[PDB]
Design a protein around this ligand. Structure first.
Ligand SMILES: [Ca+2]
Ligand SMILES: [Zn+2]
Lengths: 106, 331, 241
């Protein structure tokens, strides 16, 4: 809520004081908080703040995931076909979710 | 039946070409199984080789004849229609033979001048009324008489078959590149029966198949003037080196079999020039790899400078430039 | 298979050294350069074969006394008489020597077939060696260079262009540390991954408006919720521009 208020309201000294009061909790909840912009609903850019688990972040840095990410990036920006770009990005997302689930069995 | 056979040949054409290529491959394999002792085909205890070669040569000649007939039936009308359309549109919109009198070289227009005064000029243009429009406008301007004389409007027995038009058609047929190539194919296939080695030249038909072969072959002529001029520069610089060697270093050119034999030297101009253009430009290092070693002679530093300058200049610069010209044309 | 066969003869372990080529990237690029231009290379080798065969036919017909590859003359003569021996001689020694087939054939001095032989020699050397060997070498080298250039272009596009949202570098860089912060926090990749995983994990009843909309679009496989050249800084222009 504090992040949403600070980003949506750029100029407010009261919110600034609240931020200088809660900077510690903001720093703690920074690795867990995401930020994503979509076209979803209406015709404007929104923000989709959500939660990231510790396990998802600690399994993203596995060597298999890094190799798969490198291969996907190379194969999707080399040839591209820039609608299959988004299609294969979603497919790579699903495959990497499956690989994180598999790597959870450690 | 004649029309049916002609249409059948005009239908199956590329299949006949592939058949000719395969038969050429088989004949060249049989040729690869030769041996001298006079020329007789070595056969591994199988006397079928010579009859196979004979029937393959006969069938190849027949297939090539079918190929040329099919090409004459298929794509010659395209060339005829294109030329008729071009000349008719030119004569209508602009008008060359009536009010322009085309240029000095103008070989296409000079040959097409023979077709305007024919009874079947628009045989393929499907527009056999351009004569009326041309006669109208250009006889209302430049007089009707000149238009009438120029255009010439006014059992299967011989109806004269429009002999002038047939001659014009044959003249334009014996100019297209593909027809000339197929005529050369006919000539080589016919000559193959005289000596059964001319079928080796039919292997080059593979270069008119796949595209990259055609690009490789066209790379040689893509940069034509520059290549010829560079070869000429190579010739003149080798000639200058030949003049210098002829004047000064003549005792060094003792290309004899280990010394004390009947001496085979390079004394006259022509022998030295052929020696330089035959051995000098090919060896990896220049003319120094074949000339006797210049140790102890008074002409030592001059000879070393001659050798190094020859090697560097002609070999490095000119051979690399020619190679780069061809490779860059391909790229 | 190779490790098992190594126990039969203890030399098949040499083939395991090629595993170093599946390690470092440049080795893989070098190996893939051979097959990157495959059809053109095979066809050029075929053209080399047919032109060498034509030269073999000409030499077989006309210049046969010159092919006396004997040990200093008066020995049992080892010539090249039949077709196959001449063809193997031309494809084995002719295409390798630095200057053509003339470096091994006896010198043509005094024979009536002198100018024809010289033309044969020069044309062979020039055509086959120069043009065809240089073309094959250039094909392989240009394949290697093209692969390296493609990799460099991929890296440059990743370092100068927004992967999603497709804007570029000169737009976000108007503020200090703009593009790096944009890629790190705003339009990230692992963030989109974690958001998809979060959507999959959560129940359908607890989805908010945006989450339910994104879930519906993802279920229908209809991707317009991704940015298509617009961002927060463009639509919601800071303080409304
Ligand atoms: Ca709900
Ligand atoms: Zn972006």
């Amino acid at each position: 809520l504090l992040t949403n208020l600070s980003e949506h309201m750029p100029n407010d000294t009261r919110l600034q004081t609240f931020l200088e009061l809660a900077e510690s909790v903001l720093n703690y909840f920074q690795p867990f908080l995401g930020r994503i912009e979509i076209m979803g609903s209406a015709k404007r850019i929104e923000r989709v703040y959500f939660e990231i688990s510790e396990s998802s972040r600690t399994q993203w840095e596995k060597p298999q995931v890094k190799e798969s990410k490198r291969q996907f990036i190379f194969d999707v920006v080399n040839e591209g076909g820039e609608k299959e770009k988004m299609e294969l990005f979603v497919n790579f997302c699903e495959d990497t979710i499956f690989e994180m689930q598999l790597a959870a069995q450690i | 039946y004649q029309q049916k056979l002609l249409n059948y040949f005009a239908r199956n054409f590329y299949n006949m070409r592939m058949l000719a290529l395969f038969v050429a491959f088989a004949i060249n394999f049989i040729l690869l199984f030769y041996k001298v002792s006079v020329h007789y085909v070595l056969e591994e205890s199988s006397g079928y080789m010579e009859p196979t070669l004979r029937i393959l040569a006969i069938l190849h000649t027949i297939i090539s004849f079918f190929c040329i007939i099919g090409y004459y039936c298929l794509k010659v009308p395209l060339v005829i229609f294109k030329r008729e359309k071009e000349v008719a549109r030119k004569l209508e919109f602009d008008g060359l033979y009536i009010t322009e009198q085309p240029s000095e070289d103008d070989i296409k227009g000079q040959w097409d001048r023979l077709v305007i005064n024919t009874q079947s000029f628009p045989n393929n243009y499907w527009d056999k009324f351009v004569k009326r429009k041309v006669m109208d406008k250009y006889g209302e301007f430049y007089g009707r008489d000149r238009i009438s004389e120029l255009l010439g409007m006014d059992s299967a027995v011989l109806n004269s078959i429009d002999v002038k038009y047939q001659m014009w058609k044959l003249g334009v047929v014996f100019t297209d590149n593909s027809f000339l190539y197929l005529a050369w194919y006919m000539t080589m296939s016919v000559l193959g029966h005289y000596n059964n080695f001319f079928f080796a030249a039919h292997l080059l038909d593979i270069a008119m198949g796949f595209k990259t072969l055609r690009t490789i072959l066209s790379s040689v002529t893509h940069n034509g003037k520059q290549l010829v001029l560079t070869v000429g520069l190579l010739a003149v610089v080798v000639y200058l080196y030949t003049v210098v060697a002829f004047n000064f270093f003549r005792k060094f050119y003792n290309k004899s079999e280990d010394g004390d034999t009947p001496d085979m030297k390079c004394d006259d101009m022509l022998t030295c020039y052929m020696f330089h253009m035959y051995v000098g430009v090919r060896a990896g290092g220049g003319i120094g790899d074949e000339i006797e070693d210049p140790a102890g002679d008074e002409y030592e530093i001059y000879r070393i400078i001659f050798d190094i300058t020859f090697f560097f200049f002609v070999i490095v610069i000119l051979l690399a430039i020619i190679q780069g010209l061809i490779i860059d044309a391909f790229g | 298979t190779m490790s098992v066969l190594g126990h039969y003869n203890n030399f098949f372990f040499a083939a395991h050294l090629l595993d170093i080529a599946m390690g470092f990237k440049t080795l893989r690029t070098i190996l893939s350069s051979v097959t990157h231009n495959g059809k053109q290379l095979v066809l050029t080798v075929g053209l080399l074969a047919v032109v060498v065969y034509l030269y073999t036919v000409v030499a077989f017909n006309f210049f046969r006394k010159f092919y006396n590859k004997s040990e200093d003359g008066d020995t049992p003569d080892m010539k090249c008489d039949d077709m196959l021996t001449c063809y193997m001689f031309h494809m084995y020694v002719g295409v390798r020597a630095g200057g053509g087939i003339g470096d091994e054939i006896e010198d043509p001095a005094g024979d009536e077939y002198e100018i024809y032989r010289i033309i044969f020699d020069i044309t062979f050397f020039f055509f086959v060696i120069v043009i065809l060997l240089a073309i094959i070498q250039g094909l392989i080298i240009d394949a290697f260079g093209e692969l390296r250039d493609q990799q460099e272009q991929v890296k440059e596009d990743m370092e100068t262009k927004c992967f999603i949202c497709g804007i570029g570098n000169d737009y976000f860089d108007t503020v200090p540390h703009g593009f790096e912060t944009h890629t790190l926090q705003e339009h990230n990749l692992a963030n989109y991954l974690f958001f998809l995983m979060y959507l999959i994990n959560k129940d359908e009843t607890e989805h908010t408006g945006q989450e339910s909309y994104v879930w519906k679009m993802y279920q229908e496989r209809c991707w317009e919720f991704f940015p298509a050249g617009d961002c927060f800084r463009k639509q919601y222009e800071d303080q409304l521009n």
